[PDB]
Amino acid sequence: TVTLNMERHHFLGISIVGQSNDRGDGGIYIGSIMKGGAVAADGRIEPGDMLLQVNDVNFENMSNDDAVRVLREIVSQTGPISLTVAKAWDPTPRS
Structure with missing residues (x-):
């Protein structure tokens, strides 16, 4: 759950990945953040952020390890x- 700031039109270099669903683990998660000036300026995003959903949308059942296609x-x-994102135990010391 993150509300970016301006993106449409602009360029973005993100990626997703998967693993397997069974128990607290499987939900596609951002492969990595270019760490450029877009999502980078945001902070120190993580790959396990669990970015597989957008807006009121939730491509949970999806997790086709290629939700990017959409x-x-x-x-x-x-x-x-x-x-x-569906949250994800990540090291975030109230940055």
């Missing part, structure tokens, strides 16, 4: 911005 269709065209 996610990329968002910022690209139709689809409101508002990336979302």
Whole structure:
């Protein structure tokens, strides 16, 4: 659950990945963040952030380890911005 700031039109270099679902583990998670000036300026995002959902959307059942095929269709065209994640035990000392 993260609300980016301006993205549409602009360029973005993100990626997703999977592993397997069974128990607290499987939900596709951002492969990595270019750490450029976009998501980088945001902070120190993580790959296990669990970015497989956007806006009020939740491609949970999806987790096709390629949700990008669609996610990329968002910022690209139709689809409101508002990336979302199902949380993920990550080291975030109230940065």
